[PDB]
Amino acid sequence: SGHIEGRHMAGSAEDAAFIMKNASKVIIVPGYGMAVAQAQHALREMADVLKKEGVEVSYAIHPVAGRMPGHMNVLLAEANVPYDEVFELEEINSSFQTADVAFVIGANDVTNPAAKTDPSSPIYGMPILDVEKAGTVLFIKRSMASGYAGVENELFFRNNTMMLFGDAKKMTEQIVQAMN
Length: 180
Ligand SMILES: NC(=O)C1=CN([C@@H]2O[C@H](COP(=O)(O)OP(=O)(O)OC[C@H]3O[C@@H](n4cnc5c(N)ncnc54)[C@H](OP(=O)(O)O)[C@@H]3O)[C@@H](O)[C@H]2O)C=CC1
Description:
Layout: E1 3-5, E2 8-10, H1 13-21, E3 25-30, H2 32-37, H3 40-52, E4 56-61, H4 71-78, E5 86-88, E6 101-105, E7 136-141, E8 161-165, H5 168-179
NADPH dihydro-nicotinamide-adenine-dinucleotide phosphate is lined by residues 31-33, 36-37, 64-69, 71, 106-110, 115, 121-123, 141-143, 145-149, 167-168.
Subunit structure: Complex of an alpha and a beta chain; in Rhodospirillum, the alpha chain seems to be made of two subunits.
Subcellular location: Cell inner membrane
Family: Belongs to the PNT beta subunit family.
């Protein structure tokens, strides 16, 4: 069950299910972590349960999310995620404010502004994804560890931010189950 630990909120699979199953608009943010666990098929399934419940789903892709340009796009296509539901940062970063939930699965650095200050990084000087602008922000990852940038993300401590610790694929699978 959920609970507070340190300066962050640690939710559970059911919390995420309850929150999303009851929202009207969710925006999924896929990152490296999703690729490591090959959670794309589970993720698309989740999107299918939500869409069936009337919820509005779309995906926000950051230019350098993952480990190669367009990495998330091919993974989502692989899971048969409808092409029209995937959007690039420049054409959807402003839609976070009108979204109840921001489902951030396996992403970190692509949401953190503190990550684009290193000039030797592929993300240097690039706009970040505005996940905070949404009602609630779910972060699916194994721990409180940093990303490729090695810097700490300050969104893990926000009020509208709930951490869902676990494997990107395993956790998404539990959430799907909890949703039925
Ligand atoms: N796209 C490209 O062309 C390239 C991009 N890069 C760099 O890679 C980064 C991209 O960021 P983003 O996509 O958000 O990736 P990140 O590098 O920020 O990592 C994402 C997060 O995924 C979590 N994770 C790792 N394994 C798993 C797992 N099995 N299940 C669930 N979560 C997991 C990590 O934490 P935890 O251990 O807590 O789970 C991690 O904090 C940027 O710094 C960028 O510049 C580098 C080379 C090329």
